[PDB]
Amino acid sequence: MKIKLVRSVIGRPGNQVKTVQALGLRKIGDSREVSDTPAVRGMVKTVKHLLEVQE
């Protein structure tokens, strides 16, 4: 479950921002490997337009 930022936090609502901050991403172009457990799936769904979910 690979992820990266590809769109800025700026000018985005609060839940999107704090969620980007939770998922572990603090700069565009950050990537990460995330488990598929329901709450993490819900986070990466909440801000899915900011993220290039790998598969």
Contact residues toward RNA (CB under 7 A) are 7-19, 21-24, 26-28, 34-35, 37-43, 45-46, 49
The token pair at 13 is 């609502």
Nearer to RNA, 12 or 31 (CB): 12
Nearer to RNA, 2 or 13 (CB): 13
For residue 2, CA distances in Å to 11, 14, 23, 44, 47 come to 25, 24, 12, 10, 14
Q: How far is the CB of 4 from RNA (least distance, A)?
A: 11
Identify whether the C-beta of residue 9 lies closer than 8 Å to the C-beta of residue 37. Answer: no
Nearer to RNA, 11 or 55 (CB): 11
